[PDB]
Amino acid sequence: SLQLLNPKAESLRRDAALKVNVTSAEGLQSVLETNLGPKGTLKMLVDGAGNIKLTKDGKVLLTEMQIQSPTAVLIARAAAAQDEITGDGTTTVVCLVGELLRQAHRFIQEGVHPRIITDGFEIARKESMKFLDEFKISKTNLSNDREFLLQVARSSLLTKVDADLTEVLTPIVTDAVLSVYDAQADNLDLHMVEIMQMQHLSPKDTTFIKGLVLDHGGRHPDMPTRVKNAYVLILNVSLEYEKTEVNSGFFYSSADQRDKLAASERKFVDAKLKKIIDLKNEVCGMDPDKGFVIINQKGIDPMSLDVFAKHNILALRRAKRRNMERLQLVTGGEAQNSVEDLSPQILGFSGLVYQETIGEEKFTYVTENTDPKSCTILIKGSTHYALAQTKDAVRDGLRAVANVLKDKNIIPGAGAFYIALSRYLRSANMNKLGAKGKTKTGIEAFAEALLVIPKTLVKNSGFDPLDVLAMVEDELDDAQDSDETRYVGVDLNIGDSCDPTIEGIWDSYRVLRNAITGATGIASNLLLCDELLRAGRS
Amino acid sequence: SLRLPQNPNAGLFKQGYNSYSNADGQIIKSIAAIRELHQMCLTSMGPCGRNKIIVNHLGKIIITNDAATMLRELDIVHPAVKVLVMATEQQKIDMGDGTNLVMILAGELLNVSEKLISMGLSAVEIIQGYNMARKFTLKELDEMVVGEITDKNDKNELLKMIKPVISSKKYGSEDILSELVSEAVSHVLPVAQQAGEIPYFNVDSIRVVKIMGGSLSNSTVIKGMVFNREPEGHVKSLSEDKKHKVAVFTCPLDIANTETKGTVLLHNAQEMLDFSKGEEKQIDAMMKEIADMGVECIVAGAGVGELALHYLNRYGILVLKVPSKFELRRLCRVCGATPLPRLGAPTPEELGLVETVKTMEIGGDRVTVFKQEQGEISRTSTIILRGATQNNLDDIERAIDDGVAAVKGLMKPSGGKLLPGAGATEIELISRITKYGERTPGLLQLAIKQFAVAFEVVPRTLAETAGLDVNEVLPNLYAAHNVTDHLYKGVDIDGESDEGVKDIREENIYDMLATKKFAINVATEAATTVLSIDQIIMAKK
Amino acid sequence: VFMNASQERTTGRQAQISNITAAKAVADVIRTCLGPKAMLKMLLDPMGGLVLTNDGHAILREIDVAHPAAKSMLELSRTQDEEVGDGTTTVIILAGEILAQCAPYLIEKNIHPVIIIQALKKALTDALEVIKQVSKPVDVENDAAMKKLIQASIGTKYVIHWSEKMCELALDAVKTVRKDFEIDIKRYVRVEKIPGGDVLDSRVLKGVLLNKDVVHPKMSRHIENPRVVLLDCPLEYKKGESQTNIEIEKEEDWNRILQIEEEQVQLMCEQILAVRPTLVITEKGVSDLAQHYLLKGGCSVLRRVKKSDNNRIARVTGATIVNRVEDLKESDVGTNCGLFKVEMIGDEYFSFLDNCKESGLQKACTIMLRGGSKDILNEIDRNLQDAMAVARNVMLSPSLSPGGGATEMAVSVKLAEKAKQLEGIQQWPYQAVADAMECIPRTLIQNAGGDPIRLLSQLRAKHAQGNFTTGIDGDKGKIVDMVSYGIWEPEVIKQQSVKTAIESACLLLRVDDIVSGVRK
Amino acid sequence: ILIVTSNQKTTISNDGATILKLLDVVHPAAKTLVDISRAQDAEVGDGTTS
Numbered sequence A: 001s002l003q004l005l006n007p008k009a010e011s012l013r014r015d016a017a018l019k020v021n022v023t024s025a026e027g028l029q030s031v032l033e034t035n036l037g038p039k040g041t042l043k044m045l046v047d048g049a050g051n052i053k054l055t056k057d058g059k060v061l062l063t064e065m066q067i068q069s070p071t072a073v074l075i076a077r078a079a080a081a082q083d084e085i086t087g088d089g090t091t092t093v094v095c096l097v098g099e100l101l102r103q104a105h106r107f108i109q110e111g112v113h114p115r116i117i118t119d120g121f122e123i124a125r126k127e128s129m130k131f132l133d134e135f136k137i138s139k140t141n142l143s144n145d146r147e148f149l150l151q152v153a154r155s156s157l158l159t160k161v162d163a164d165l166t167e168v169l170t171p172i173v174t175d176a177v178l179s180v181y182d183a184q185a186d187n188l189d190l191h192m193v194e195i196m197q198m199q200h201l202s203p204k205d206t207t208f209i210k211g212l213v214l215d216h217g218g219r220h221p222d223m224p225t226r227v228k229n230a231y232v233l234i235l236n237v238s239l240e241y242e243k244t245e246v247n248s249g250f251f252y253s254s255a256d257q258r259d260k261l262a263a264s265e266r267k268f269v270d271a272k273l274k275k276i277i278d279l280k281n282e283v284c285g286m287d288p289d290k291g292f293v294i295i296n297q298k299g300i301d302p303m304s305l306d307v308f309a310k311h312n313i314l315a316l317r318r319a320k321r322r323n324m325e326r327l328q329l330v331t332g333g334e335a336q337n338s339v340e341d342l343s344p345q346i347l348g349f350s351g352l353v354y355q356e357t358i359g360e361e362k363f364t365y366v367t368e369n370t371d372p373k374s375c376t377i378l379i380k381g382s383t384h385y386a387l388a389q390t391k392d393a394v395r396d397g398l399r400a401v402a403n404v405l406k407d408k409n410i411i412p413g414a415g416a417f418y419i420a421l422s423r424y425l426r427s428a429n430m431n432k433l434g435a436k437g438k439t440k441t442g443i444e445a446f447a448e449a450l451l452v453i454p455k456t457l458v459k460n461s462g463f464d465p466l467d468v469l470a471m472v473e474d475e476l477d478d479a480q481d482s483d484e485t486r487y488v489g490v491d492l493n494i495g496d497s498c499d500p501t502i503e504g505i506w507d508s509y510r511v512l513r514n515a516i517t518g519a520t521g522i523a524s525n526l527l528l529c530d531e532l533l534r535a536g537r538s
Numbered sequence B: 001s002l003r004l005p006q007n008p009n010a011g012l013f014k015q016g017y018n019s020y021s022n023a024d025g026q027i028i029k030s031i032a033a034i035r036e037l038h039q040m041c042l043t044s045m046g047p048c049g050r051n052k053i054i055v056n057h058l059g060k061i062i063i064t065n066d067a068a069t070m071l072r073e074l075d076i077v078h079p080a081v082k083v084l085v086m087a088t089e090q091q092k093i094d095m096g097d098g099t100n101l102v103m104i105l106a107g108e109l110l111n112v113s114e115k116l117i118s119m120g121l122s123a124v125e126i127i128q129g130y131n132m133a134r135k136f137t138l139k140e141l142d143e144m145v146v147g148e149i150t151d152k153n154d155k156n157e158l159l160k161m162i163k164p165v166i167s168s169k170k171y172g173s174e175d176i177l178s179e180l181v182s183e184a185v186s187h188v189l190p191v192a193q194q195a196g197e198i199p200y201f202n203v204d205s206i207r208v209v210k211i212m213g214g215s216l217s218n219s220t221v222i223k224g225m226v227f228n229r230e231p232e233g234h235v236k237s238l239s240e241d242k243k244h245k246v247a248v249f250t251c252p253l254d255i256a257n258t259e260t261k262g263t264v265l266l267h268n269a270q271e272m273l274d275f276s277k278g279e280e281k282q283i284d285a286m287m288k289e290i291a292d293m294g295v296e297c298i299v300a301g302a303g304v305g306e307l308a309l310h311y312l313n314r315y316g317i318l319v320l321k322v323p324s325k326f327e328l329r330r331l332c333r334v335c336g337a338t339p340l341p342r343l344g345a346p347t348p349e350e351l352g353l354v355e356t357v358k359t360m361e362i363g364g365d366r367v368t369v370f371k372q373e374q375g376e377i378s379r380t381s382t383i384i385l386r387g388a389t390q391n392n393l394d395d396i397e398r399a400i401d402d403g404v405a406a407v408k409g410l411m412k413p414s415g416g417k418l419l420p421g422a423g424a425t426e427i428e429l430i431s432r433i434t435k436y437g438e439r440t441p442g443l444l445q446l447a448i449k450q451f452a453v454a455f456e457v458v459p460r461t462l463a464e465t466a467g468l469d470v471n472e473v474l475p476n477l478y479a480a481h482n483v484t485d486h487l488y489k490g491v492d493i494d495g496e497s498d499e500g501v502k503d504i505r506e507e508n509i510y511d512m513l514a515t516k517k518f519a520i521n522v523a524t525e526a527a528t529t530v531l532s533i534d535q536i537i538m539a540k541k
Numbered sequence C: 001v002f003m004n005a006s007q008e009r010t011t012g013r014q015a016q017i018s019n020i021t022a023a024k025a026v027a028d029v030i031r032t033c034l035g036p037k038a039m040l041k042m043l044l045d046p047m048g049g050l051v052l053t054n055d056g057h058a059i060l061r062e063i064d065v066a067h068p069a070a071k072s073m074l075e076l077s078r079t080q081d082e083e084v085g086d087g088t089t090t091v092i093i094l095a096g097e098i099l100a101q102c103a104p105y106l107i108e109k110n111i112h113p114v115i116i117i118q119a120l121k122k123a124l125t126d127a128l129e130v131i132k133q134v135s136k137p138v139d140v141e142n143d144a145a146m147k148k149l150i151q152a153s154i155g156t157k158y159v160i161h162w163s164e165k166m167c168e169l170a171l172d173a174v175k176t177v178r179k180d181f182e183i184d185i186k187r188y189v190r191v192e193k194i195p196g197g198d199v200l201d202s203r204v205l206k207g208v209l210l211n212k213d214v215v216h217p218k219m220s221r222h223i224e225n226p227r228v229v230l231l232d233c234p235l236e237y238k239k240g241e242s243q244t245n246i247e248i249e250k251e252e253d254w255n256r257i258l259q260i261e262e263e264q265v266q267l268m269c270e271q272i273l274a275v276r277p278t279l280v281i282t283e284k285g286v287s288d289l290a291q292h293y294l295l296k297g298g299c300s301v302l303r304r305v306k307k308s309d310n311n312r313i314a315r316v317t318g319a320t321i322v323n324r325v326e327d328l329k330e331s332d333v334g335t336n337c338g339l340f341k342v343e344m345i346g347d348e349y350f351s352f353l354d355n356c357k358e359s360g361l362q363k364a365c366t367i368m369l370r371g372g373s374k375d376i377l378n379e380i381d382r383n384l385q386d387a388m389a390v391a392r393n394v395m396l397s398p399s400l401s402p403g404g405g406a407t408e409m410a411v412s413v414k415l416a417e418k419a420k421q422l423e424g425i426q427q428w429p430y431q432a433v434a435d436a437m438e439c440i441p442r443t444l445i446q447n448a449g450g451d452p453i454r455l456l457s458q459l460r461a462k463h464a465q466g467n468f469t470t471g472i473d474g475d476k477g478k479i480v481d482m483v484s485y486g487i488w489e490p491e492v493i494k495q496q497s498v499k500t501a502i503e504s505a506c507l508l509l510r511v512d513d514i515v516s517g518v519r520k
Numbered sequence D: 001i002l003i004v005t006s007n008q009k010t011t012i013s014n015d016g017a018t019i020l021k022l023l024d025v026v027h028p029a030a031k032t033l034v035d036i037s038r039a040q041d042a043e044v045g046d047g048t049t050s
């Protein structure tokens, strides 16, 4: 019928559209499920320009590789919204949507309508929230213990790199959120940490710095790199020549006025710089071991570097926009644009400032702050792809530890929630059915589709999933024979059950929320889709 | 049964994407394919190594036995090779030599691990094996040190340092090039009774000025620098003043002009008559002050006007452009002055001293020589290379850059101690790691043994380039280590090498501790990445 | 320009590197096609058929590789199939490893490709010695052990479930073809197929099975004691050799010419009725008239029967190939025929010839196959060739070598122990022979899903102390001795595997350069 | 030796300095003779053919 409207159109309806949706989901599942867990494989995104990059997150794999199929675009957009708000759990979303469409399509072939199947997923979804809010546990984060944050960070960073690099990098994640905390307002910013890309000794030789680190060096050699006590000063207006906005030109009457009109531009430079020199000696004159550094966002005149070089003034330029907020948090200063009003109160303080010449560039290091409300992480590496790999590891690990402070509740990992949720969604007696023999088909499909996560971890480790889960369902049952909350997990070293809690594996509360909510919505709408169409004007 | 169903995941990722996962055979495809380029760096290894001519797409030909330099220009489509490419570049921008050792050791760990993967050992265990073997290698290298140096000032002490590095690249020239580099370092370092607290050193201190023609023996050392530039205005006196104050200007010497654009405005003809003399008297007020203090040389980075050049010719002041900004500051380090952008006039404190400046032709082209005697210098030197071809002089420059980079590798850390070279410490590490594997029972013992076998290429590669049998001198060398004297056993390269034993101290071949540690770490990290990947995803073009 | 060459001469070390990589690639295709848990392979030929199998020989027949070094590896399967008929995948998978292990040395320790050859002949000479010592004899007349010997190869195929019937099917067929030294040949083994039916009712029956029916309806469809007589000639008047041209002058000649056409066929039919046969099997076609009086005596006429099917009838019925009908006697007439009967099947008619069963010429037989489809028939037919091939080696050679990789592992241990006492330049290639012989158990462990690291380590620890018959159970993946496991293979297959694999390496190792595109 | 380049301008010479400069050499090994000839022409100015 569609060909009569547009001969150049196409349409798959009610059997070919369903196979496309399920095969595209299973095809996306079979490729991308291998990255799940610590034993997952590394992918090399080699584009046409030859750029090499190692990663295991499903967000960046699907972002660089354009998706041709229309179904997998909807799943990639779900991983984008998952990675956007949360930053973790993209591999669980594509596996749940692939398994839900697989388990649902098993029943659609048996002659069941898609409507009551999706109705069972929503009742099963709401039943999981009534199971999740009872399954979570509350802890007191006021103590600020380091042992809990390390093992929680180790659980997230083991799924990115091997063990020896995780042990070196897992203190860097815990050191990121030391001072950034507010009990009353409950405000916690993630963007204040600064990720610098540079080539140095090795990835395993990185370290945490308390204060700020800028990528700009001193232009003149005469200024001192070592400064024992520095008072920062924030500038935003550009010190160079700014053409008068209103078009203008110097028409000199004689040759004697040429150098005088050249000195007219020198007066406006000396006018705004004289207050800077007066600001230096206002604190104390002839004070050794006390420097004065200036951080400007816009450019600096090279003619003016001689003025800063004579008085031993460190000047940096072309700074970032978000760094202006980070200066006052680290150094404790105050941001200023003009130079009309100046005082020693607005100035910050720093205990140590130094520079290091690495290659054809120089990096400025500002450390030894009194009460800094921010910090930075140097991403050192032996190549170009390790920087992006460690950058994705930190950007995915910062969200896992930051959610512990946003909400004190935390779920045990190692597939404990998926295994425990399977039994609870078996038999809904008279709680929430809605109809006889209709909703229960979807309850069974949703319960069986959640257990693919612990099986996928076992497939990557190289053991049998049914054998290691037999003792596990069993362990949980024996636990039940005692009326006790013994949470069981999946250990990939020996192929046996373990306690998620005791051993050291956790998951964030918001990961499982948006993953189950996003997967159930996409799995529902794709089952409701009965026909694919295309139309347009080339 | 004619056309296949065409892999019904073809609705997924486009045809340009290629997957080469494992189980299918990715490891077997990779470790092998890279054996071609492994033989490239293997043949170019040692003092008798063969340089390789690489013609890039632009046509700039380069001929080198330096492996790194090679892989920068090679457009390599294989992604697994590129992990080894920029991993070697990290050694270049940092340590500066060994570019070839890190590539050979990184490739051999993949070649020798064929037995582990083929037998069926887990890939995750192999990464844990080499990591623990890497830690034992770093701890064990400190005990085999016998070259603890603390002077690092005199020229004869550098014969154990620079000459092994220069002996690798173009082995025939040892004493001549070592004299140029060692004499350059002595001019760079200051004269003092005790210079400590980590004195500063950089690779930009020693520069290389390439001159066409002349034998390599006729080269000499210059404390200043030499530019291919035409002087203007006059001939120098060369002994009369005995010393010359040199002002370096960033801005030019011209009637000063404004940033925003202006023009000449004249309301009447009275200003027209005085405008011709006003420009002359304006510069004369600023130029006469410069000549009062006796500044016999001016350097202006931008273009100098003819009006400013005319006033300087009669007083006999030397002029020079120096358009590039990087080489402008190096001249300031020689005289010991600071940049003075504005024309102005100057001061005794900011102006430096230069003994003499003389102009001649070294290879037919007129050049300006800033050589000075009895003057004070600080971090500046040059080596005038004379050679028959530009292609050969390019390799001498990188050999000197690797030589002075080793000086940066010594003086920047607290200790750059030596080690026995010529296939001496590598065979010792095979005995150490062989004994270490038996101490820890477990399934990872196979990885520890195969990690030691990868170090075998270092002695035999010197024997293969020497035209010797590997199955004779290599097992005979193990009998020499049975038992100080056993530590200084190495590989001989001579017609009398049938015995296969030559003492190291007769010729003083040594290697750096920090260079081999950084090479072993980057080599292990390079092999760690290639063995950790399983899937490789390509794209169109 | 110069002669048709020098396109891109692969010379030096890189030429041999491509051959080792190409030879290794042939074994990787059928790496999973070994052991009891081996996977099947469906290959698509360009004509339109399909070959479903796991035998390495049948797989490599259909494949086509445009490389000269890999084609020499392709021909080794024809060496094994047309010598014994079993272990073709074993030949291809072992050689790959031998070329691969010798490679490290060729590439790096620079041992010239001739010194490796001298090392392998001494390894080949020692391999036959230990294979002769490890093998134990077995009685040939023991039917209980013969059934377990025949089903050793069937266990690696689809019909292991019907192994109780296939061993009885193959044992009866081999003894029929066996001549009372003990030489047998599979050219009389009829591979006739019947699509459909159940495997249980499928059975061997003594005699032949035709695809045709009788010509005239009045022919007897059930004869108690048939008497078969083979004919080669046309039974009809034929044109004749020379330029003939009868010229007819009188009117009474043309009817005479057409009348002698009736009398000549009467003369050849009447002399056939001197012995009064019941069944006359003619090679070429038959006329409608001669058949009519063959009927006036009690014979039975059939359509043209190809030669092949008559040479089997000559050995079954005991008749001789006869063309001249005037020299037909009573001694050359076939006799002792059991039964004659024609069944109705929708495909075609089928005439059965049974034997009385009661030295002389060797008897032939036809094995009935009742599969599920056409590909199941061709799959089962190749299993009989692989199963009946095992029965020939025990008769030609009473020796019996242990299976399950125990024989090749025994070669690995003795060559490894003796390599230390073989001090010299030949030690490195001689020790590398054991590295490949321990892979043919490694492939079984990989297909079984176990870890070959600890199993092979446990294997070598128990092989020197426990016994020489230790091996890996392919189903369970544990160390189980072959004596209790009760599965054995002949020693002749082990000889051809070691000989053909090493002799293939000696040819390919001498390759220096490759030059393609010279001429036809 | 008479050489005529692609731009069609005649250039006759006896010494090997400018003969090799006219013929644009592609091969790197053949450029070695051209480099020493220009180097000998630049340094001394005699014996460029020998």
Ligand SMILES: Nc1ncnc2c1ncn2[C@@H]1O[C@H](COP(=O)(O)OP(=O)(O)O)[C@@H](O)[C@H]1O
Residues within 6 Å of the ligand: A035, A036, A037, A038, A056, A057, A088, A089, A090, A091, A092, A155, A156, A158, A159, A413, A414, A415, A416, A457, A490, A491, A492, A505, A507
């Ligand atoms: N060490 C571990 N042991 C067992 N399970 C783990 C471990 N680390 C992570 N997991 C499981 O992997 C799942 C996803 O974690 P992760 O890989 O960090 O996110 P993503 O799959 O988005 O990269 C979690 O639900 C968790 O149960």
Ligand SMILES: Nc1ncnc2c1ncn2[C@@H]1O[C@H](COP(=O)(O)OP(=O)(O)O)[C@@H](O)[C@H]1O
Residues within 6 Å of the ligand: B045, B046, B047, B097, B098, B099, B100, B101, B102, B164, B167, B168, B169, B421, B422, B423, B490, B491, B492, B493, B507, B509, B510, B511, B515
């Ligand atoms: N005359 C000689 N006798 C013995 N060995 C030598 C001689 N000259 C050079 N060598 C050896 O050749 C090797 C070349 O090493 P090379 O690859 O240049 O070092 P790197 O990898 O650090 O740059 C050195 O390790 C040195 O020991």
Ligand SMILES: Nc1ncnc2c1ncn2[C@@H]1O[C@H](COP(=O)(O)OP(=O)(O)O)[C@@H](O)[C@H]1O
Residues within 6 Å of the ligand: C034, C035, C036, C055, C056, C086, C087, C088, C089, C090, C152, C153, C154, C155, C156, C403, C404, C405, C406, C444, C472, C473, C474, C475, C487
């Ligand atoms: N049940 C079994 N358990 C372990 N190994 C077996 C078993 N059956 C056969 N093998 C091994 O497989 C090899 C090939 O046997 P088979 O499959 O019969 O020949 P082909 O390779 O020609 O198919 C033999 O060398 C034998 O060691």
Ligand SMILES: Nc1ncnc2c1ncn2[C@@H]1O[C@H](COP(=O)(O)OP(=O)(O)O)[C@@H](O)[C@H]1O
Residues within 6 Å of the ligand: D014, D015, D016, D045, D046, D047, D048, D049, D050
């Ligand atoms: N008058 C002469 N008699 C003998 N030999 C000569 C004479 N002139 C030149 N020669 C020799 O012949 C060679 C001439 O070199 P030639 O090719 O003519 O000049 P160039 O080498 O500059 O191109 C020189 O090696 C020189 O030794």
Ligand SMILES: [Mg+2]
Residues within 6 Å of the ligand: A088, A089, A156, A159, A396
């Ligand atoms: Mg994660």
Ligand SMILES: [Mg+2]
Residues within 6 Å of the ligand: C086, C087, C153, C156, C386
């Ligand atoms: Mg077989």
Ligand SMILES: [Mg+2]
Residues within 6 Å of the ligand: D046, D047
């Ligand atoms: Mg001449």
